[PDB]
Amino acid sequence: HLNFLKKRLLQQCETLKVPPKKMEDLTNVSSLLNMERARDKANEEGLALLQEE
Amino acid sequence: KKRQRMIEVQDELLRLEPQLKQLQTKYDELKERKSSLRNAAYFLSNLKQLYQ
Secondary structure (H helix, E strand, O other): OHHHHHHHHHHHHHHOOOOOOOOOOOOOHHHHHHHHHHHHHHHHHHHHHHHHO | OHHHHHHHHHHHHHHHHHHHHHHHHHHHHHHHHHHHHHHHHHHHHHHHHHHO
């Protein structure tokens, strides 16, 4: 039953229609997001220091 | 963008400093010149009056 449900869901999602878009792979989203926060903090503090000067 | 603003304001300050430095000095001898001149005039007048 689970295999039948899985294959039918594959058929349904293949038949499905969506507006065009670009998506990055699900496995690596977390790490890249973490480095993005790190870059966020570094650039924020740098800009704040420059503005203060 | 902000880095360039920092650089150019630094240039501004670096150029402005000598002008104030010169102006303060000039005023400094000008005032003393006036005071010494008035003192000398008073002294010469007094000595001339005394001798007369």
